[PDB]
Scaffold this motif. Structure first.
Motif, mmCIF file in Angstrom:
data_model
loop_
_atom_site.group_PDB
_atom_site.id
_atom_site.type_symbol
_atom_site.label_atom_id
_atom_site.label_comp_id
_atom_site.label_asym_id
_atom_site.label_seq_id
_atom_site.Cartn_x
_atom_site.Cartn_y
_atom_site.Cartn_z
ATOM 1 N N UNK A 216 100.977 25.669 34.017
ATOM 2 C CA UNK A 216 100.293 26.952 34.089
ATOM 3 C C UNK A 216 99.452 27.124 32.842
ATOM 4 N N UNK A 217 98.516 28.060 32.914
ATOM 5 C CA UNK A 217 97.604 28.287 31.819
ATOM 6 C C UNK A 217 97.309 29.763 31.677
ATOM 7 N N UNK D 154 109.612 36.861 16.544
ATOM 8 C CA UNK D 154 108.628 36.991 17.607
ATOM 9 C C UNK D 154 109.157 37.826 18.759
ATOM 10 N N UNK D 187 98.647 41.710 18.923
ATOM 11 C CA UNK D 187 98.977 41.895 20.324
ATOM 12 C C UNK D 187 99.793 43.149 20.531
ATOM 13 N N UNK D 232 94.516 36.650 24.020
ATOM 14 C CA UNK D 232 95.899 36.533 24.445
ATOM 15 C C UNK D 232 96.275 35.093 24.756
ATOM 16 N N UNK D 233 95.599 34.132 24.129
ATOM 17 C CA UNK D 233 96.006 32.739 24.246
ATOM 18 C C UNK D 233 97.272 32.538 23.441
ATOM 19 N N UNK D 234 98.404 32.671 24.100
ATOM 20 C CA UNK D 234 99.613 32.978 23.368
ATOM 21 C C UNK D 234 100.281 31.763 22.756
ATOM 22 N N UNK D 244 98.474 26.879 22.584
ATOM 23 C CA UNK D 244 98.343 26.281 23.900
ATOM 24 C C UNK D 244 97.402 27.121 24.738
ATOM 25 N N UNK D 245 96.702 26.461 25.644
ATOM 26 C CA UNK D 245 95.852 27.143 26.603
ATOM 27 C C UNK D 245 96.285 26.879 28.032
ATOM 28 N N UNK D 246 96.409 25.617 28.410
ATOM 29 C CA UNK D 246 96.955 25.236 29.703
ATOM 30 C C UNK D 246 98.401 24.856 29.429
ATOM 31 N N UNK D 247 99.271 25.849 29.509
ATOM 32 C CA UNK D 247 100.632 25.693 29.067
ATOM 33 C C UNK D 247 101.415 24.768 29.963
ATOM 34 N N UNK D 256 107.598 27.423 25.956
ATOM 35 C CA UNK D 256 106.278 26.900 26.260
ATOM 36 C C UNK D 256 106.124 25.592 25.516
ATOM 37 N N UNK D 257 105.815 24.533 26.242
ATOM 38 C CA UNK D 257 105.741 23.216 25.649
ATOM 39 C C UNK D 257 104.339 22.670 25.813
#
Ligand SMILES: [Zn+2]
Ligand SMILES: [Zn+2]
Ligand SMILES: [Zn+2]
Ligand SMILES: [Zn+2]
Lengths: 351, 344, 367, 284, 198, 460
Positions: A216-217, D154, D187, D232-234, D244-247, D256-257
């Motif tokens: 996902x992105x 966080x 945020x 919000x590119x978290x 990350x963008x495409x998580x 999230x990896x």
């Protein structure tokens, strides 16, 4: 005199993704007079409330709504991730009136058909708000139940004022045997809390199943206003998001990209999940005479502690319900608020 | 209307009138009689006297009565002493009646057991959702000129005839046709009622409507939705079959002085097994505002709020002038119709 | 019951769904009638809609109540075609073959609508349901009586077809008297026993039709103490509290803030050519679904030729939109053309990027 | 429409020294303290006598300042009581400073501060059912170095966000320090409908404060004053540390990896994955 | 009357008929319907074969009834003669013996509706004469039959049973009050009554 | 409401600055301005430099710029600021006296007047003399309304009521009856009542020896906060001291006995501006002592009671026999026709019932409320919040006794084209300000908001 859960003994796993297919009950039974307007109106109102709540707490799942009129299951909202559609559908229904007999079998089969596209990592579920005391099946039912449990589809139902044997069998069957999911109600408030506890993800003791990484992105908001243009509803919308990969606009949502079909989220959804995974130890109520702690609150500053020797009043209790790990006090209001709304324990945060 | 629908076979229940000669002193079974025949000045023949003689002869173990309040209790006590019965029954209609004399007909018959709780009946589904309204028909110059002209009681039809009243009636007709509802109108007038009926151009009940025609219109009104408005005059009421009430309109408000309002409320508002409309029993009192009967329309409003039925007033009619057939809309034609009514 | 290839080949179902939604049939034809997409993949996207529709369709109602009811709960409307007329009669037919057969036999003559059902009232609704009419209205005539005679032995043979060798827990038969040969007494008047057998037979027939399964530290403390003193050192002259001090500094702060207010204000949270607007919207929907199919396929993978066809079509669509923009600039001028370009910028960029990405992947595979 | 502005001023003597270290030592927090007092008075005057509250975050815990928990057991002069009490408490707190105070520098209790403040807001709102309080809190932080982005706080921050949104309590934040956009705080203000202000150190905020930290009580027809975009590119990958963008997010773990799956047992929850699923991911 | 139409609308009816085979068939369909969705009613005779051996577990029985109280002397005087022998040979009077037999059959009917302690179920009666027999019943039935539940009208009966069904539906499983009435594995009996060896 | 703010702006600019010399007064009037203006003023107070208007427009987003106009028109009307067409632009800035006084107040200024209070042993008990002040207020209220025996000796107060025409009573015959002024006195609960009385004292006490600056200084210092010590002793002008003694007579000052001491700060001066809790020989139950009953059945349901309060209720309903918890009274069309005889509009009573008698209708207003505002968009049917059935009945009675319809505004013209008229009509429908319009005549009689917004759009 206390009414508390002793301990949580699955604080290790839940179904974070969901696809819950709530099925209402719109059949002649729901027209009796036990709940204030009727069964039906109160039911739909609480259903709206539950829809809002559930799509809040599980903001990455989908949902579909199903009625049971005239022995037929007529889908009233496709399985979709936008709460407003389902909300509107329920609005529409509430002005329409029930008829026919509830055909539990048909609804079950329609669901099992409905949840096929849901991928393996996503988890399935159904929630029968069964109101009547009978069904009317055009087929074998145990056939369907067997097919269900073959398709790994947990089911939870909320009967109205009785217990039906087949439903009890149904819940006991799909949920890996462990029967706890056929809870039926005895009061309206009981009903509110019933839906509330239906909101959360559902563990019992999960069999070791496939655990799978999901692509996902995240999107990035857009800037221009007059350039209003949409690729998920084909309108002019003054500004939205961009799929990082498909790279096409998408009206505001956690939806799936309608171009390259990958899930979209910001993070705050993931934050809600985190909140559900690893909750706190239930705050302990301090001993009445053995506390000898600070006479205030801690997170707030309340003056509700004791009264110091008052025949029966002081003999009652000492409002000092204090969490364990941080071992700091907290008045009843603060503890209720922490354990309900925000789950960062105040003191336990600070050290 | 009911006793053959009921299990009763009229073969034994001979009907006596002092004009309708029937089988007395030979009826094998129960009988049905009337206060006028039983004891009243309307003894046109000795058939009533023979019926009373037979009533004395046989110890009638029970008696059924319907609306005894209108008839004075004197004849009731006379026949109570004359017949020497075993038991009786009072099917009353009003809480307070003129026959509440020193010897109460209760202890003459028996104690109370049930009260006709109309809030319980006209809301559970029989006549459920009774909404009442008093639309104030706008005033016009001619009506007040007539008001200043005379102070007699001839103003009844003079303020009744208001064409805006018919415009509101037609809007109600079209609205209930759109909703598929049923409309009852109370209009004892003759000339103005027929003029309004001509203006609307639909099948209509009116003054002294033929019984076969009245039944046909009732069928086409409660069953068929092409016609849904009936104008009930003062000729029927206590002489005709009460049709299902879904939308009642009242025009005249004289009805003697009192208790006629209560009887009309009890009877005209009959059971209606319809729940499509949120207010399955509309009551309307089209009243020409700024007229003589404003005081009596307020009297009606107070009476109704005493009755407990839901009441309102709708004078902000939606599309009041948007209705078709705006004939006689102008105050000039209102004055011309006033000239017409002055003849009446 | 529902399969991907099944819904793919359910052509009549697919066309029915085409009839389902004007938007659906529109987008489909403009993806097809515009020399565009084979319907196969077009549905291959839309499969869940098909499944949903199919399930919403073939949904047999239960037998049960309405089935029964069709003999009990149905005793009033002596008028024309009553409630659920066709539904009720089909429930009857599945419920009782005899009536279906009689009605069919009485199609060429003797209408079964009014007079058929009138005589049926007497005949059947005495036969089934209530007690033996025997006397009274014996209108059970012709077909009615014939079917009566039939149904007698018919129900008989059915009941015959019902007898299981019940498991020996319940076996009342073997339970009673079939242990001994004894001599009792008995003392506990015909007819109505048939009524009881009737209700038993109805119920069991129903159920069987359901079993069918159909610095730090030091200096830190130092500075800290310094400040602590300064505080304690009376001070705290709120008058001396800046106010704004340097009028210039003040001004600069205001500048910053009005700048930011302006920029964020630029967020005013209406096309000209309504017909061209709708046309462009159609073009956007078209290009969107086209790219949808690629970005499905270009990810997923052995159907390379299908991807090739998709890519050629997409390049054609890109050139088509380029010509569209050219024509828009020619006819609508510039401002309207500018608005169109703005409306189509995102989709245009996405498809261009998809084309470039395919070109890169194709070069990588080739070279 | 009364409002409960509950400032949350954090004071790390480490970060206080950093503020002295930053630029010159041309003035300690004293500037901030005085400006805060004045702004607090301003709000206390603006409305129809609407309460306030203040919390701190020193190196080894937090403690209230204004509401002044039971201790014994000029200008309108209520300003006087508020301010003198606050300053007495803060000097008391500054007495609470030593080497053992210098010891537990591991954490930064800001998250505890926000959480407790929210609890306070709930307490006050619940007790005062009549005359519902359109409350909203604040945040003042001395932006120091030695940690580009501490993340062990966080989650509780985001839990604070969600509590705030449910409670309908805008939360505005003012970071004073180096040009490091406090992403989580950013945020937080953006999501909870707030306003972010990354001032420079030594300017007398009072203008900044009274301008852009006074329009959040119960107005909201007015454009907020937030800085540049709030992407919000978290969170960066738990394993990697690059945004990350495409998580690629595992499962029940939820971590999230990056594009670099270790192939098994995502490195935050011991959950070996279907190697078939791994290959399916690798099918690209 | 139309009475049967309503119960048709809700549940299934399965009568009891003299031929045993058809009776068995009906009974098994009753079971099959109960464990299925549709509720099903079986109405039989107290003296009849059904009450003799057939069992009614949790699902298969919730609310027995006793329309009237079973008595025999409907028919002729063989009971009269035996009762004569009874009175002369044993110091027992007629109505005593008759009531005793009737309550024997009543208790036999009633006891069928429970199997374990997890099971449950209403056990109504219906007749004026029942009220005085409350002592004739077997003890464990009598205990549950409190005084306040006598000569109730049908309406309060429905109220009470509604409350019952709801309450029992609850998963009231403290599992510590069940250490009182279950005497758990090998221990609570061992402990409790090995100490109760007093 | 005469809206004392309107009286505030009535006075000229130089005397306005005279008043602004007193910082506490500056603060107290800061309390009154609309919130938009409050925020803008607080912005401007510190940066010692004028500011262009364009920024103060861009600050406010749409859907609310009407409040922008409200604020600017108010502030300009009272001239707290000075608009400056310096370079043809608009260089806004406050009356500098205002700015300096306010800023002094925020950070320890030199407002000895505001600091006139004295801190000492305030032996004044909460009930102590608070009950006396409440009793005096009740006594004057009853005497003005007219009780069976009105012991109101406020000869100055009576003169103010009469010359001020406080109530439609024949003071020549001694009558103190409810006129339009009397009806308003029956209407304005506390802030309204105290305010009308203060305005009356202002109008009457305005001829000689006023020192209006000192007058308002004294008034607001009373309203500011508990001065306590040395107030009556020191912190007062000579005429200030006389006015203080007069106010203490009027109840609004809770001065102690001995005729010479510090100021006695009664709760009433607090009540002047608080808009908050309204509760005041030695008996006073702690509860919503207000008692009445108003529901769908149009009847009085009184269990709690208060003599002057229940008399106020009777002012529009019949009385037959006062009971222990109840008083014989039933609210009907004739009941309000009694007040319609006085011609009292059925307007103040609406919000009165929504607010007053709620000490006996808390649960009623809660069940009517049901929080059916967040639930309003979901469930489209409100649950009789602020009962509109009774509202309709009251409106019907008012129309029946009214027979006349009137509208506010002014006639409008110079709508040269139909396009401007249609666009203005659409804008007004968006804002709900057009009572009625017609393009054929290009005229109407409505509020000025649409014209104001169109003119502002055109000019700037
Ligand atoms: Zn969209
Ligand atoms: Zn995409
Ligand atoms: Zn607390
Ligand atoms: Zn803790």
């Amino acid at each position: 005199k206390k009414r508390t859960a002793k301990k949580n003994i699955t604080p290790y796993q839940r179904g974070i993704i969901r696809s819950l297919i709530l099925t209402l009950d719109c059949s002649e039974a729901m027209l009796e007079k036990d709940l204030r307007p009727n069964r039906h109106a109160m039911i739909i109102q609480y259903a709206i409330d539950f829809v809002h709540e559930f799509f809040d707490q599980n903001p990455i799942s989908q949902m579909g709504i199903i009625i049971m009129r005239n022995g037929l299951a007529q889908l009233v909202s496709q399985v979709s991730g936008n709460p407003q559609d389902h909300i509107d559908a329920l609005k529409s229904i509430r002005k329409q009136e029930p008829k026919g007999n509830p055909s539990l079998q048909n609804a079950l089969e329609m669901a099992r058909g409905l949840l096929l596209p849901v991928p393996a990592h996503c988890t399935r579920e159904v929630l029968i708000v069964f109101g009547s005391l009978s069904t009317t099946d055009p087929g074998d039912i145990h056939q369907t139940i067997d097919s269900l449990v073959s398709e790994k589809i947990r089911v939870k139902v909320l009967g109205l004022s009785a217990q039906v044997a087949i439903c009890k069998e149904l819940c006991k069957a799909t949920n890996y045997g462990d029967e706890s999911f056929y809870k039926i109600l005895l009061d309206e408030t009981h009903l509110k809390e019933l839906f509330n506890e239906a909101v959360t993800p559902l563990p019992v003791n999960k069999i070791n199943k496939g655990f799978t990484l999901v692509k996902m992105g995240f999107p990035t908001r857009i800037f221009e206003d007059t350039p209003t243009f949409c690729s998920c509803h084909s309108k002019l919308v003054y500004g939205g998001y961009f799929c990082p990969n498909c790279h096409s606009k998408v009206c505001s949502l956690p939806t799936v990209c309608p171009c390259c079909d990958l899930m979209l989220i910001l993070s705050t959804h993931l934050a809600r999940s985190y909140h559900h995974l690893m909750p706190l130890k239930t705050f302990a109520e301090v001993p009445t005479t053995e506390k000898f702690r600070s006479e205030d609150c801690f997170s707030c500053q309340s003056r509700f502690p004791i009264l110091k020797n008052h025949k029966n009043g002081k003999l009652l209790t000492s409002s000092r319900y204090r969490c364990e790990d941080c071992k700091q006090e907290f008045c009843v209001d603060c503890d209720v608020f922490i354990h309900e709304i925000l789950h960062n324990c105040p003191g336990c945060e600070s050290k | 209307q009911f006793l053959q629908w009921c299990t009763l076979q009229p073969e034994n229940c001979a009907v006596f009138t002092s004009d309708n000669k029937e089988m007395f002193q030979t009826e094998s079974g129960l009988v049905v009689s009337t206060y006028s025949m039983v004891a009243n000045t309307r003894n046109r023949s000795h058939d009533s006297q023979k019926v009373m003689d037979f009533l004395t002869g046989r110890e009638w173990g029970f008696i059924i009565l319907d609306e005894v309040h209108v008839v004075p209790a004197a004849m009731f006590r006379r026949v109570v002493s004359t017949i020497a019965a075993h038991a009786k029954l009072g099917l009353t209609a009003t809480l307070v009646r003129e026959d509440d004399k020193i010897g109460d007909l209760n202890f003459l018959i028996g104690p109370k057991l049930y009260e006709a709780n109309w809030m319980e009946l006209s809301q559970k589904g029989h006549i459920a959702n009774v909404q009442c309204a008093e639309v104030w028909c706008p005033m016009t110059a001619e009506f007040y000129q007539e008001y200043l002209r005379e102070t007699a009681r001839k103003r009844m039809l003079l303020y009744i005839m208001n064409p805006t009243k018919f415009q509101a009636c037609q809007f109600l007709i079209q609205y209930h046709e759109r909703r598929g509802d049923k409309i009852i109108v109370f209009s004892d007038n003759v000339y103005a009622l027929q003029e309004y009926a001509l203006k609307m151009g639909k099948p209509f009940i009116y003054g002294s409507t033929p019984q076969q025609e009245r039944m046909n219109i009732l069928q086409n009104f409660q069953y068929n939705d092409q016609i849904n408005t009936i104008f009930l005059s003062k000729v029927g009421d206590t002489s005709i079959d009460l049709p299902e009430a879904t939308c009642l309109i009242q025009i005249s408000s004289h009805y003697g002085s009192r208790r006629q309002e209560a009887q009309r409320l009890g009877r005209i508002l009959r059971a209606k097994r319809r729940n499509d409309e949120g207010f399955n029993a509309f009551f309307y009192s089209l009243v020409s505002k700024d007229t003589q009967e404003m005081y009596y329309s307020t009297k009606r409003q107070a009476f109704l709020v005493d009755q407990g039925y839901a009441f309102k007033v709708i004078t902000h009619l939606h599309g009041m002038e948007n209705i078709p057939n705006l004939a006689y809309a102008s105050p000039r034609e209102r004055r011309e119709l006033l000239q017409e009514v002055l003849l009446k | 019951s529902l399969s991907k290839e099944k819904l793919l080949t359910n052509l009549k179902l697919q066309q029915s769904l085409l009839k389902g939604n004007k938007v659906l049939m529109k987008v489909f034809q403009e993806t097809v009638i515009n020399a565009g997409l084979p319907p196969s993949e077009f549905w291959s996207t839309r499969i869940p809609l098909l499944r949903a529709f199919a399930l919403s369709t073939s949904q047999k109602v239960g037998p049960y109540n309405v089935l029964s009811t069709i003999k009990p709960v149905a005793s009033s409307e002596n008028k024309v075609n009553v409630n659920l007329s066709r539904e009720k009669i089909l429930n009857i037919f599945e419920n009782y073959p005899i009536v279906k057969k009689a009605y069919t036999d009485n199609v060429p003559k003797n209408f079964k609508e009014p007079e058929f059902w009138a005589r049926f009232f007497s005949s059947k609704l005495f036969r089934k349901l209530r007690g033996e009419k025997i006397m009274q209205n014996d209108r059970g005539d012709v077909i009615i009586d014939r079917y009566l005679t039939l149904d007698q032995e018919f129900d008989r043979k059915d009941d015959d077809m019902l007898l299981h060798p019940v498991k020996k827990i319940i076996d009342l038969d073997g339970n009673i008297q079939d242990d001994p040969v004894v001599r009792g007494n008995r003392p506990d008047s015909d007819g109505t026993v048939d009524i009881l057998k009737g209700m038993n037979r109805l119920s069991e027939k129903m159920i069987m039709a359901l079993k069918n399964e159909y610095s730090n530290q030091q200096m830190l403390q130092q500075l800290s103490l310094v400040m602590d003193n300064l505080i304690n050192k009376l001070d705290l002259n709120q008058v001396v509290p800046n106010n704004e001090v340097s009028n210039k500094i003040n001004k600069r702060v205001i500048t910053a803030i009005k700048i930011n207010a302006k920029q964020a204000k630029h967020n005013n949270v209406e096309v000209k050519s309504t017909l061209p607007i709708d046309l462009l919207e159609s073009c956007r929907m078209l290009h969107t679904t086209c790219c949808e199919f690629l970005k499905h396929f270009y990810i997923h993978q052995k159907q390379a030729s299908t991807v090739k066809k998709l890519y050629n079509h997409l390049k054609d669509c890109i050139e088509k939109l380029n010509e569209l923009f050219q024509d828009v600039l020619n006819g609508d001028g510039e401002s309207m053309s500018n608005t169109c370009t703005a409306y189509l910028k995102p989709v245009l960029n996405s498809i261009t990027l998809a084309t470039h990405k395919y070109d890169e992947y194709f070069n990588e595979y080739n070279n | 429409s009364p409002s409960l502005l509950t400032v949350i001023i954090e004071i790390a003597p480490k970060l206080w020294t950093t503020f002295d270290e930053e630029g010159n030592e041309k003035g300690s927090i004293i500037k901030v303290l005085e400006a805060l007092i004045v702004f607090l008075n301003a709000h206390l005057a603006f409305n129809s006598a609407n309460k306030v509250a203040v919390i701190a975050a020193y190196s080894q815990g937090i403690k209230y300042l204004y509401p002044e928990s039971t201790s014994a057991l000029d200008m309108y002069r209520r300003f006087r009581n508020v301010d003198e009490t606050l300053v007495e408490e803060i000097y008391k707190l500054f007495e609470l400073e030593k080497k053992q105070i210098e010891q537990n520098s591991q954490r930064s209790t800001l998250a505890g501060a926000m959480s407790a403040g929210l609890t306070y807001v709930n307490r006050i709102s619940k007790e005062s059912v009549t005359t519902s309080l359109k409350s909203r809190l604040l945040v003042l932080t001395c932006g120091s170095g030695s940690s580009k982005d501490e993340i062990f706080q966080y989650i509780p921050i985001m839990n604070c966000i969600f509590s705030a949104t449910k409670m309908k309590c805008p939360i505005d934040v003012v970071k004073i320090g180096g040009s490091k956009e406090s992403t989580f705080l950013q945020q937080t203000t953006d999501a909870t409908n707030g306003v972010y202000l990354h001032v420079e150190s030594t300017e007398g905020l009072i203008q900044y404060l009274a301008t852009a930290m006074f329009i959040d009580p119960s107005l909201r027809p007015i454009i907020v004053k937030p800085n540049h975009g709030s992407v919000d590119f978290r969170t960066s990958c738990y394993l990697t540390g690059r945004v990350v963008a495409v998580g690629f997010i595992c499962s029940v773990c939820l971590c999230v990896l990056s594009i670099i799956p270790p192939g098994n047992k995502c490195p935050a929850c011991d959950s070996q994955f279907d190697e078939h699923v791994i290959a399916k991911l690798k099918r690209k | 009357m139309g009475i049967l139409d309503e119960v048709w609308k809700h549940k299934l009816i399965l009568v009891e008929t003299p031929d045993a085979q058809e009776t068995s068939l009906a009974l098994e369909t009753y079971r099959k319907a109960c464990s299925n969705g549709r509720g099903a009613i079986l109405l039989s005779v107290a003296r009849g074969k059904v009450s003799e051996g057939i069992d009614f577990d949790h699902q298969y029985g919730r609310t027995v009834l006793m329309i009237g109280i079973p008595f025999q002397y409907t028919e002729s005087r063989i009971l009269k003669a035996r009762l004569e022998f009874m009175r002369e040979n044993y110091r027992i009077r007629e109505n005593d013996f008759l009531s005793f037999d009737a309550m024997r059959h009543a208790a036999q009917c009633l006891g069928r509706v429970l199997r374990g302690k997890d099971d449950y179920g209403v056990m109504v009666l219906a007749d004026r004469r029942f009220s005085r027999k409350r002592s004739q019943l077997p003890k464990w039935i009598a205990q549950g039959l409190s005084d306040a539940d006598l000569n109730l009208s049908t309406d309060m009966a429905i109220s009470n049973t509604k409350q019952f069904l709801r309450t029992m539906a609850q998963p009231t499983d403290p599992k510590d009050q069940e250490g009182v009435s279950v005497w758990s594995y090998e221990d609570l009996i061992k402990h409790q009554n090995s100490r109760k060896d007093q | 409401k005469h809206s004392v703010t309107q009286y505030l702006e009535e006075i000229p600019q130089q005397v306005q600055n005279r008043l602004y010399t007193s910082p506490a007064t500056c603060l107290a009037i800061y309390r009154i301005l609309p919130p938009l203006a409050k925020f803008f003023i607080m912005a401007m107070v510190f940066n010692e430099n004028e500011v262009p208007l364009l920024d103060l427009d861009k600050w406010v987003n749409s859907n609310g710029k009407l409040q922008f106009q409200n604020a600017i028109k108010s502030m300009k009307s009272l001239h707290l600021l000075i608009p400056n067409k310096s370079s043809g632009t608009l260089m806004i800035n406050l009356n500098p006296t205002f700015k300096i006084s306010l800023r002094n107040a925020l950070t320890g200024g030199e407002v000895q007047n505001s600091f006139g209070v004295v801190v000492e042993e305030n032996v004044v008990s909460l009930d102590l003399l608070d009950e006396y002040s409440a009793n005096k207020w009740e006594t004057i209220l009853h005497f003005m309304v007219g009780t069976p025996l009105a012991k109101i000796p406020s000869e100055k107060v009576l003169n103010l009521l009469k010359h001020s025409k406080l109530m439609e009573e024949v003071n020549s015959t001694g009558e103190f009856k409810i006129t339009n002024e009397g009806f308003q006195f029956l209407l304005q609960e506390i802030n309204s009542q105290l305010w009308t009385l203060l305005l009356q004292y202002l109008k009457m006490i305005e001829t000689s020896k006023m020192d209006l600056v000192d007058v308002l200084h004294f008034i607001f210092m009373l309203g500011a906060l508990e001065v306590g010590k040395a107030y009556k002793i020191d912190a007062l002008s000579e005429t200030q001291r006389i006015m203080l003694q007069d106010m203490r007579d009027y109840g609004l000052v809770f001065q102690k006995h001995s005729n010479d001491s510090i100021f006695y700060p009664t709760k009433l001066a607090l009540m002047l501006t608080s808009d908050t809790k309204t509760i005041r020989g030695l008996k006073n139950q702690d509860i919503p002592d207000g008692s009445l009953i108003v529901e769908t059945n149009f009847k009085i349901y009184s269990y709690s009671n208060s003599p002057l309060q229940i008399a106020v209720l009777s002012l529009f309903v019949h009385l037959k026999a006062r009971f222990v918890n109840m008083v014989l009274g039933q609210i009907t069309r004739e009941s309000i026709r009694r007040a319609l005889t006085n011609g009292i509009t059925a307007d103040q009573i609406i919000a009165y019932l929504e607010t007053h008698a709620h000490p006996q209708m808390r649960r009623l207003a809660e069940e009517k409320l049901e929080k059916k505002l967040e639930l309003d968009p979901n469930c489209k049917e409100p649950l009789q919040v602020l009962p509109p059935t009774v509202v309709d009945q009251i409106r019907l009675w008012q129309l029946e006794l009214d027979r006349v319809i009137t509208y506010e505004g002014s006639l409008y013209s110079d709508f040269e084209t139909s396009q401007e008229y249609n666009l203005l009509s659409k804008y007004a429908q968006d804002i709900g300000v057009l009572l009625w319009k017609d393009d054929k005549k290009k005229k109407f009689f409505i509020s000025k908001e649409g014209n104001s917004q169109v003119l502002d759009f055109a000019k700037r």
